[PDB]
Amino acid sequence: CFLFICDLIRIYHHVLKVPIHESNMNLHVEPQIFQYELIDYLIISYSFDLLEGILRVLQSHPKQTYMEFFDENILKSFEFVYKLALTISYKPMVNVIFSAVEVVNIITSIILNMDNSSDLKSLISGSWWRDCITRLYALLEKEIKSGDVYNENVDTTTLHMSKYHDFFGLIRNIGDNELGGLISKLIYTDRLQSVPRVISKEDIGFTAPIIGYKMEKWLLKLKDEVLNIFENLLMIYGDDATIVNGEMLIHSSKFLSREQALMIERYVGQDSPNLDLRCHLIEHTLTIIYRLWKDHFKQLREEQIKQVESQLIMSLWRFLVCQTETVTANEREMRDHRHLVDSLHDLTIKDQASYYEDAFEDLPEYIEEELKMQLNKRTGRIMQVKYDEKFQEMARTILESKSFDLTTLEEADSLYISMGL
Amino acid sequence: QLTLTTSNDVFDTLLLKLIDIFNSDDYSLRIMMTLQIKNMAKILKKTPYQLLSPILPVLLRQLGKNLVERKVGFQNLIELLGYSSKTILDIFQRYIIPYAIIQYKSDVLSEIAKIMCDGDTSLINQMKVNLLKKNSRQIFAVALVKHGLFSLDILETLFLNRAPTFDKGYITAYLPDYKTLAEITKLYKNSVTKDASDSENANMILCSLRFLITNFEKDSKYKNINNWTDDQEQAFQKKLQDNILGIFQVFSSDIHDVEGRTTYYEKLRVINGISFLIIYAPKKSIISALAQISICLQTGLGLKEVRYEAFRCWHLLVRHLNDEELSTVIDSLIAFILQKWSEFNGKLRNIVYSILDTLIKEKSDLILKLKPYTTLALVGKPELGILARDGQFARMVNKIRSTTDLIPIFANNLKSSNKYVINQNLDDIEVYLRRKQTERSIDFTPDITLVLGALLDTSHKFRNLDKDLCEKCAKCISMIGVLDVTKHEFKRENEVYDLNDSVQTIKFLIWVINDILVPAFWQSENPSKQLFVALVIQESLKYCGLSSESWDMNHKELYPNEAKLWEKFNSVSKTTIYPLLSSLYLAQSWKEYVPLKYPSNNFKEGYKIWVKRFTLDLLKTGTTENHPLHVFSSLIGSLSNFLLPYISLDIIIKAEKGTPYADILNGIIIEFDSIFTCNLEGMNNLQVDSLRMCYESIFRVFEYCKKWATEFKQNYSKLHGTFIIKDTKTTNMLLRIDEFLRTTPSDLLAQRSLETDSFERSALYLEQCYRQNPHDKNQNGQLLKNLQITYEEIGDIDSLDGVLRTFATGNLVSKIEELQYSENWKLAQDCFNVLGKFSDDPKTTTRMLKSMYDHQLYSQIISNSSFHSSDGKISLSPDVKEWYSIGLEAANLEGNVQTLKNWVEQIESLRNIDDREVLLQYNIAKALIAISNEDPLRTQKYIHNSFRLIGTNFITSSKETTLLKKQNLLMKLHSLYDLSFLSSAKDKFEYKSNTTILDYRMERIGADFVPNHYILSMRKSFDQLKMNEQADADLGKTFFTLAQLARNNARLDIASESLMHCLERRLPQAELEFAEILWKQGENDR
């Protein structure tokens, strides 16, 4: 079934290969038909969803029984359809990107969780790796902005989830499913037919950009998954290889630095629900930097650290600035600050405390004592001052560490004075 | 983020303020600035290299001072940029060598050698001498300007201090180059104000400007203005006139950078230099510089970062120039401001306020007396508020809205090139035409056909660019509507041509320069081609070689000959080329033969190089320093065909040749036969429109030799022509037509003539092969049938009728297409519908639906069950999709909800929609069901889609069509716009107003039955769609009126079937004229 879906998608070839831009005379005069587009968008999306389903049920199959599934043709067919999915010169369908990276997640996960990883990695050519990782880098170097999700804009920077493919999907309910009534109206329902019932294409389409916020929530989970499989493949190759090669200092450091800098510039005080996960991205890719630094220093070349010398040390300093502890120091004003920025999590925790938790009633004055610590450290982690001390220590034990001359001692004090110290 | 809110000037200055405090060598400052610049670069979606490359010529210019010290700062800068040092060094060495050479003696030139050659110390001397061999002009600029030293000996000191290979003392004096003057004029390093430092280095750059060949090697000091005497300026004036053309052609080469790795800092100092040189130049120089200085700052205007300086250089251009000229280059002003105002900040808003109130302040003769389109555009957008700015000119613009014959100047200014001004022209057309529609008195006098043909052939031209312009032009001619041929025309050789007589060669060449100067030489692109422009107008005035030794306009006055030759010289040309009467530019001695008689490039290329070699061969054999035709060797994509006609008239010179003239004639004619061998090869557009256009161009020079041959017989018979032989040159004339009369592959000649447009002469060269043939012969029938399909192209239905009745008698089902147009269409129609009733044959069924269409049995078309069945129509619409494409229009002009709805939602189920017309009628039908669902914005969406379809896919040009053939387009677009704006109606007052000016449309339609019927039946379809009650009153009266015109044109079955719907709604006048159709036909009694 898996190889059938892979060569099925290489049959349904031209869907993920619509070009970046139309011509100057590529007219939008058209019958404005949507039915064939709906057919093959559902074909492609359900196909990749099925690939994801095959691999999670294959994951559920035990840790002795994979070589029956895996041979070279698995990897070759998926490598073609993966380059087809995370495209470069064509318009990307974000739906299939979710599935395609979740596939690689399941792959690397079972590579970690089997004993005979050697037969699988010996089946694997490193070309498959270094062709996957480039598309992962180009994916992670994109941006997430609510006001132009459902706009059609510049490519390869905005995972934008186009209006003409907006439904749920088989595993997750990725959008609003504006198209579900159109799936119902795909057929005449009183008749036996094979030709589709009509969908004029632009009848679809101002009330709430909460749709944009939840789509941002999906995309933040997506970039979390990208750095998660980066973490997973590093734990696969504890040893060094073609792909454990230092570029996960560069690209992950660029991501960490940008999602800290314009976090501080743009987000703290924007009271969208996505702030906490967007600043959990940096919290997790800090550890992705950290254990790459500590446990994988052997390949970390002298040239590439100088390729990223500014952003790495500056990203560490944006945690080492938080050891000052001159904002919080109490309880009183911090809850005013979480009225300022973290009223949305207040709504969340009041809805959970009022409906959806057994332990959240008749609180015996030890368990809201937990709340008046954890909401406050959470809203501090939003407010970008007062991270956790363990994350501050992990940022400290890279810059201060003498494994590499990041700073000299007469340059480090120039950063210590930028807090005091 | 402070820099993030800054536009160009403040943006650049603050980027400098970013990087210098980055280079303030604090470690925390260093790392934070690198981080912020990289994030700023990625959120601006640029690399840091191209981000900072606007100021990197400014930035490391001072690093060139202390590059012996600031190697660490330069190292941080290059690792910030990510490149190597040499990668930016070789391209930004233009701006460090200035302040590396003339500075202190312990040079960083040794270190730029050390980086310029890194792996080798092979020869640092040749490294030095070749980068200075590339860039040694620039140190002439710095040494004469940046520290003002003049002495040639200290110049040689700064040469040979570091350049020992710089031999022969001083190497070849290339310092009088136009490129050298164009790079020395680049120190108008101004400010927002004028410093005393700005004044003194302005006088310094004036001194280094005036320092040239008069004391080149003869040095005086020229560090002071005092040696600028009152004698040397005139030789300086004409020498600078010789410079300026090469100067801003160098500027044009600079700003049209094919390298594209450079920045706009060169462009900004180009704007500085242009501003400076128009500060300092006389009237003769500043008007010899007129044409593509404008195109240079159009290129400046287009870019996102060199606006404000180009706007103030507009402003000083307005300052330093009067109003007699300058008309031809200021359309760009009103075009750019009226098409792009919505971006502009307060800075650009109040400086363009300064522009406009300057223009209405001192230049009212140009604005409100010479170019009234500028006035009408500026007040036709009063959104910018110019009446609120000044207000006193309200009486003047009220008079100018009255006092313009505005249609011909629409036709003139609409013939421009770039999108902006013509978009503004048709926007003026749009607002002016809806205004004339409201005031009910637009003049359709026996002209508006000029401006509609201008719109038509511009939309013909834009078939591959700016579909939005095509759409807006389409809706403009939808607003112009129909303009029936019945009292109107469609305006579209010039004079008898020869070679001998002097005054006719003068008139000939002045018509030549009139044709080639004002469209084509006011807008070219190649700097060598504008030098060629100057060269050809220079040799034209060498042929009329006056005003170069003693003649001026009335300063000389001494002979009325050039007074006559200047008054017959046109006033537009008098404006544009009077400062070039003393042109001093000289060509080069021409090259080898580059041999000929290749049919391979004639096949595969043609007009690219073979037609060019064709021209160059026959001119280098043609004149050879006898005519202006000698100099045209350096134009060789529009520079051809026209010239291609007039180049090949060189046959007159011989009776006994002794010369390769008949050789090259027979050679090019057998090359044309090698063209004639070609039959489409089973190949795509690279055959079937490229070689087709080759056929068309060589076909064009064919019909020119037709035209010139007959007019070159008429010209020698104007006075008298019975002297016929004219001493053997008439025998040469009939020898030319003897060759051309043997040059008739009449099969293939007429074949390719019929294959291209060429309708009437394709018919004529069928006519001559009906003359010379066996009359009863097998080869006649194909040249009957393509003759009748080209008469379907010709549109003369009765010429078609005469052809189908004159020996076209094959089958009986071929002979019953004549009563089709011989007044008896009913027997023809039911013959075709019993022919095609089995619904399997393509031909009979297509002509069934088409002949059923062509006399308006449209209810029977829509009720015809060739598409209606137990299901809908045929899915995957076959090769007989013209069944659909003739049915959807009848379904439009007689409509309902349900049949239109289910049938166009059947036809949407196609996978592809390859025909243009089915998509046209589809989208007008989907607009109709959208307003059945009552959504007028989506209705206008599909109406504008249909506008896009016709503007991009339907429109043919002028010169080819009496607009009977256009009626199928302009009829539908008139109906579509009439549908459109009262789709965009609000209430009944608006509705009755819309129908009243629709009655004005029914006034201006004339009385052509098929468009009459079509437009008001479309109106009928819409107000029976709309079930509103005044829509029903309008319905009843339009049923009545189409019954009236159907009575007037005497086909009163459709009068009955329309007139019923107002008979049953109690209209006794409709009863009376039902009674009159019955009285008309046969039925006196009832």
Side-chain angles (χ1 to χ4, degrees), chain A residues 63-64 66-67 70 75 107-121 123-124 128-129 232 235-237 239:
Chain A
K63 67 181 180 68
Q64 296 83 16
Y66 292 103
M67 293 299 291
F70 290 102
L75 296 175
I107 292 168
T108 58
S109 178
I110 63 171
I111 290 168
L112 288 171
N113 294 118
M114 66 180 73
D115 57 354
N116 192 1
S117 297
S118 177
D119 292 330
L120 272 297
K121 293 188 288 184
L123 181 66
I124 293 168
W128 183 66
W129 293 110
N232 291 317
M235 293 180 69
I236 295 170
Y237 294 99
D239 58 352

Tab-separated table of all heavy atoms in Angstrom, chain A residues 63-64 66-67 70 75 107-124 128-129 232 235-237 239, unseen atoms left out:
chain	number	residue	atom	x	y	z
A	63	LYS	N	9.380	-3.811	17.583
A	63	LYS	CA	10.740	-3.366	17.317
A	63	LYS	C	11.645	-4.484	16.815
A	63	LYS	O	12.873	-4.365	16.895
A	63	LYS	CB	11.332	-2.687	18.557
A	63	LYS	CG	11.583	-3.564	19.772
A	63	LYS	CD	12.147	-2.710	20.904
A	63	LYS	CE	12.416	-3.520	22.162
A	63	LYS	NZ	13.530	-4.488	21.966
A	64	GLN	N	11.068	-5.548	16.275
A	64	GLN	CA	11.823	-6.618	15.662
A	64	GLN	C	11.447	-6.818	14.209
A	64	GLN	O	12.098	-7.606	13.516
A	64	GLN	CB	11.594	-7.937	16.415
A	64	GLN	CG	12.091	-7.953	17.852
A	64	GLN	CD	11.095	-7.348	18.821
A	64	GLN	OE1	9.920	-7.186	18.495
A	64	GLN	NE2	11.560	-7.002	20.014
A	66	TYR	N	10.802	-4.779	11.213
A	66	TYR	CA	10.804	-3.674	10.266
A	66	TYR	C	11.414	-4.017	8.921
A	66	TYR	O	11.013	-3.428	7.913
A	66	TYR	CB	11.539	-2.475	10.850
A	66	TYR	CG	10.813	-1.874	12.007
A	66	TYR	CD1	11.229	-2.099	13.302
A	66	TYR	CD2	9.714	-1.065	11.803
A	66	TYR	CE1	10.571	-1.528	14.356
A	66	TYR	CE2	9.037	-0.501	12.859
A	66	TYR	CZ	9.469	-0.742	14.137
A	66	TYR	OH	8.811	-0.187	15.207
A	67	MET	N	12.364	-4.956	8.881
A	67	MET	CA	13.046	-5.301	7.637
A	67	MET	C	12.108	-5.885	6.593
A	67	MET	O	12.412	-5.815	5.398
A	67	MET	CB	14.176	-6.284	7.920
A	67	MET	CG	15.297	-5.685	8.731
A	67	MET	SD	16.035	-4.306	7.846
A	67	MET	CE	16.831	-5.173	6.499
A	70	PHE	N	11.001	-2.529	5.192
A	70	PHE	CA	11.986	-1.613	4.651
A	70	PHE	C	12.894	-2.303	3.650
A	70	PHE	O	13.487	-3.343	3.947
A	70	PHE	CB	12.806	-0.987	5.770
A	70	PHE	CG	12.033	-0.016	6.600
A	70	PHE	CD1	11.545	-0.377	7.842
A	70	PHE	CD2	11.802	1.269	6.139
A	70	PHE	CE1	10.835	0.514	8.607
A	70	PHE	CE2	11.094	2.171	6.899
A	70	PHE	CZ	10.607	1.790	8.134
A	75	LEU	N	12.779	3.830	0.388
A	75	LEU	CA	13.531	5.065	0.538
A	75	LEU	C	13.610	5.842	-0.762
A	75	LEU	O	13.540	7.070	-0.740
A	75	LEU	CB	14.932	4.751	1.045
A	75	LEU	CG	14.944	4.123	2.434
A	75	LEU	CD1	16.355	3.720	2.807
A	75	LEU	CD2	14.361	5.085	3.449
A	107	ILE	N	10.325	7.887	10.944
A	107	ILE	CA	11.510	7.169	10.477
A	107	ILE	C	12.626	7.263	11.502
A	107	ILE	O	13.111	6.247	12.008
A	107	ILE	CB	11.964	7.719	9.115
A	107	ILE	CG1	10.943	7.392	8.032
A	107	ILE	CG2	13.329	7.179	8.746
A	107	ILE	CD1	11.176	8.145	6.758
A	108	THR	N	13.016	8.489	11.846
A	108	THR	CA	14.096	8.700	12.802
A	108	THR	C	13.736	8.191	14.188
A	108	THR	O	14.615	7.706	14.914
A	108	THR	CB	14.438	10.180	12.858
A	108	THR	OG1	13.264	10.916	13.218
A	108	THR	CG2	14.941	10.648	11.511
A	109	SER	N	12.450	8.236	14.540
A	109	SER	CA	12.008	7.717	15.823
A	109	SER	C	12.193	6.212	15.905
A	109	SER	O	12.701	5.702	16.909
A	109	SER	CB	10.547	8.086	16.054
A	109	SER	OG	10.087	7.556	17.282
A	110	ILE	N	11.822	5.482	14.854
A	110	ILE	CA	11.985	4.040	14.970
A	110	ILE	C	13.440	3.641	14.789
A	110	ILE	O	13.862	2.616	15.336
A	110	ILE	CB	11.062	3.283	14.004
A	110	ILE	CG1	11.387	3.587	12.549
A	110	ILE	CG2	9.629	3.637	14.283
A	110	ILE	CD1	10.652	2.699	11.596
A	111	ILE	N	14.228	4.453	14.070
A	111	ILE	CA	15.678	4.254	14.027
A	111	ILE	C	16.271	4.366	15.424
A	111	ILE	O	17.120	3.560	15.824
A	111	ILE	CB	16.328	5.251	13.048
A	111	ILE	CG1	15.955	4.911	11.610
A	111	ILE	CG2	17.841	5.270	13.180
A	111	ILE	CD1	16.321	5.993	10.639
A	112	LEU	N	15.792	5.333	16.204
A	112	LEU	CA	16.215	5.427	17.596
A	112	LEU	C	15.714	4.251	18.428
A	112	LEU	O	16.447	3.733	19.277
A	112	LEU	CB	15.739	6.748	18.194
A	112	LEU	CG	16.467	8.004	17.722
A	112	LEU	CD1	15.766	9.253	18.216
A	112	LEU	CD2	17.892	7.968	18.255
A	113	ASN	N	14.483	3.803	18.194
A	113	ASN	CA	13.856	2.856	19.104
A	113	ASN	C	13.954	1.406	18.643
A	113	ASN	O	13.268	0.543	19.199
A	113	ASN	CB	12.397	3.237	19.343
A	113	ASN	CG	12.262	4.549	20.078
A	113	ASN	OD1	11.704	5.514	19.562
A	113	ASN	ND2	12.803	4.601	21.288
A	114	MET	N	14.792	1.111	17.658
A	114	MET	CA	15.114	-0.273	17.356
A	114	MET	C	16.526	-0.585	17.828
A	114	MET	O	17.333	0.312	18.083
A	114	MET	CB	14.994	-0.571	15.859
A	114	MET	CG	16.004	0.166	15.017
A	114	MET	SD	15.874	-0.178	13.258
A	114	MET	CE	14.386	0.693	12.796
A	115	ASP	N	16.818	-1.879	17.955
A	115	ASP	CA	18.178	-2.289	18.284
A	115	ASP	C	19.048	-2.416	17.038
A	115	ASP	O	20.230	-2.059	17.066
A	115	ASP	CB	18.162	-3.598	19.080
A	115	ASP	CG	17.461	-4.742	18.349
A	115	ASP	OD1	16.872	-4.523	17.268
A	115	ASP	OD2	17.516	-5.880	18.857
A	116	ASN	N	18.483	-2.915	15.942
A	116	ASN	CA	19.236	-3.116	14.708
A	116	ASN	C	19.034	-1.914	13.789
A	116	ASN	O	18.488	-2.002	12.688
A	116	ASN	CB	18.818	-4.420	14.036
A	116	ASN	CG	19.759	-4.835	12.909
A	116	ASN	OD1	20.749	-4.162	12.614
A	116	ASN	ND2	19.441	-5.952	12.268
A	117	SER	N	19.521	-0.769	14.264
A	117	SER	CA	19.538	0.427	13.434
A	117	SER	C	20.572	0.336	12.323
A	117	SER	O	20.503	1.113	11.365
A	117	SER	CB	19.821	1.656	14.295
A	117	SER	OG	18.802	1.862	15.254
A	118	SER	N	21.529	-0.590	12.442
A	118	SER	CA	22.643	-0.663	11.503
A	118	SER	C	22.192	-1.118	10.127
A	118	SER	O	22.668	-0.594	9.117
A	118	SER	CB	23.718	-1.605	12.038
A	118	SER	OG	24.777	-1.730	11.105
A	119	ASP	N	21.273	-2.085	10.067
A	119	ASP	CA	20.759	-2.544	8.781
A	119	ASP	C	19.963	-1.450	8.090
A	119	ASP	O	20.065	-1.271	6.872
A	119	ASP	CB	19.895	-3.783	8.979
A	119	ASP	CG	20.696	-4.980	9.425
A	119	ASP	OD1	21.888	-5.065	9.065
A	119	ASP	OD2	20.137	-5.836	10.142
A	120	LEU	N	19.207	-0.677	8.866
A	120	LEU	CA	18.426	0.413	8.302
A	120	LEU	C	19.327	1.530	7.802
A	120	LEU	O	19.190	1.987	6.665
A	120	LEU	CB	17.433	0.940	9.337
A	120	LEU	CG	16.053	0.274	9.428
A	120	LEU	CD1	15.311	0.485	8.123
A	120	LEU	CD2	16.082	-1.207	9.786
A	121	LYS	N	20.287	1.954	8.620
A	121	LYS	CA	21.192	3.013	8.201
A	121	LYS	C	22.163	2.558	7.123
A	121	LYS	O	22.692	3.400	6.395
A	121	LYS	CB	21.965	3.546	9.400
A	121	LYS	CG	21.101	4.261	10.412
A	121	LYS	CD	21.963	4.919	11.466
A	121	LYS	CE	22.564	3.884	12.392
A	121	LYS	NZ	23.341	4.516	13.489
A	122	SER	N	22.409	1.252	7.004
A	122	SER	CA	23.205	0.732	5.903
A	122	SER	C	22.391	0.651	4.623
A	122	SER	O	22.947	0.787	3.527
A	122	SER	CB	23.760	-0.646	6.267
A	123	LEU	N	21.085	0.415	4.747
A	123	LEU	CA	20.180	0.603	3.621
A	123	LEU	C	20.154	2.059	3.181
A	123	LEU	O	20.056	2.358	1.985
A	123	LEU	CB	18.782	0.143	4.022
A	123	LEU	CG	17.648	0.212	3.011
A	123	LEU	CD1	17.890	-0.738	1.859
A	123	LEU	CD2	16.350	-0.087	3.725
A	124	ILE	N	20.246	2.973	4.136
A	124	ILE	CA	20.205	4.402	3.849
A	124	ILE	C	21.523	4.853	3.238
A	124	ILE	O	22.596	4.622	3.805
A	124	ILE	CB	19.903	5.198	5.124
A	124	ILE	CG1	18.498	4.914	5.621
A	124	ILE	CG2	20.021	6.648	4.856
A	124	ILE	CD1	18.259	5.431	7.001
A	128	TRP	N	20.295	10.572	0.767
A	128	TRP	CA	18.926	10.726	1.248
A	128	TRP	C	18.866	11.684	2.430
A	128	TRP	O	18.005	12.578	2.472
A	128	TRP	CB	18.375	9.353	1.627
A	128	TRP	CG	16.964	9.347	2.072
A	128	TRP	CD1	15.868	9.638	1.323
A	128	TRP	CD2	16.485	9.026	3.377
A	128	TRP	NE1	14.731	9.518	2.079
A	128	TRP	CE2	15.085	9.145	3.348
A	128	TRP	CE3	17.106	8.657	4.571
A	128	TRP	CZ2	14.295	8.901	4.466
A	128	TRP	CZ3	16.324	8.414	5.677
A	128	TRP	CH2	14.933	8.536	5.621
A	129	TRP	N	19.824	11.553	3.356
A	129	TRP	CA	19.952	12.491	4.464
A	129	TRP	C	20.174	13.909	3.963
A	129	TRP	O	19.302	14.769	4.109
A	129	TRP	CB	21.112	12.117	5.375
A	129	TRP	CG	21.023	10.868	6.161
A	129	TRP	CD1	21.743	9.732	5.967
A	129	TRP	CD2	20.138	10.602	7.255
A	129	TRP	NE1	21.405	8.794	6.907
A	129	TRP	CE2	20.404	9.294	7.694
A	129	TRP	CE3	19.154	11.346	7.909
A	129	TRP	CZ2	19.724	8.711	8.755
A	129	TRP	CZ3	18.483	10.767	8.968
A	129	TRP	CH2	18.770	9.462	9.379
A	232	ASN	N	16.381	14.525	17.009
A	232	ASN	CA	16.322	13.077	16.882
A	232	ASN	C	17.468	12.546	16.040
A	232	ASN	O	18.089	11.543	16.400
A	232	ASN	CB	14.984	12.673	16.278
A	232	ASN	CG	13.836	12.911	17.225
A	232	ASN	OD1	13.927	12.610	18.415
A	232	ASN	ND2	12.758	13.488	16.713
A	235	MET	N	20.649	12.601	17.948
A	235	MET	CA	20.738	11.459	18.848
A	235	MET	C	20.929	10.142	18.107
A	235	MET	O	21.448	9.188	18.696
A	235	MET	CB	19.507	11.397	19.736
A	235	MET	CG	19.435	12.545	20.708
A	235	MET	SD	17.970	12.429	21.734
A	235	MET	CE	18.417	11.002	22.712
A	236	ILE	N	20.510	10.061	16.843
A	236	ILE	CA	20.911	8.934	16.001
A	236	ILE	C	22.414	8.960	15.799
A	236	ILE	O	23.139	8.047	16.210
A	236	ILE	CB	20.192	8.967	14.641
A	236	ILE	CG1	18.691	8.783	14.794
A	236	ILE	CG2	20.745	7.882	13.726
A	236	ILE	CD1	17.928	9.054	13.534
A	237	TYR	N	22.901	10.022	15.180
A	237	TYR	CA	24.322	10.178	14.957
A	237	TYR	C	24.910	11.019	16.083
A	237	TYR	O	25.232	12.199	15.936
A	237	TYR	CB	24.579	10.777	13.587
A	237	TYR	CG	24.175	9.858	12.476
A	237	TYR	CD1	22.964	10.025	11.824
A	237	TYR	CD2	24.999	8.815	12.084
A	237	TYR	CE1	22.583	9.181	10.805
A	237	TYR	CE2	24.629	7.963	11.066
A	237	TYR	CZ	23.421	8.150	10.429
A	237	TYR	OH	23.045	7.304	9.410
A	239	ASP	N	27.719	9.856	16.825
A	239	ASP	CA	28.934	9.979	16.036
A	239	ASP	C	28.752	11.008	14.921
A	239	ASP	O	27.640	11.416	14.586
A	239	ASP	CB	29.347	8.624	15.453
A	239	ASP	CG	28.266	7.987	14.581
A	239	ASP	OD1	27.127	8.492	14.523
A	239	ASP	OD2	28.572	6.976	13.915
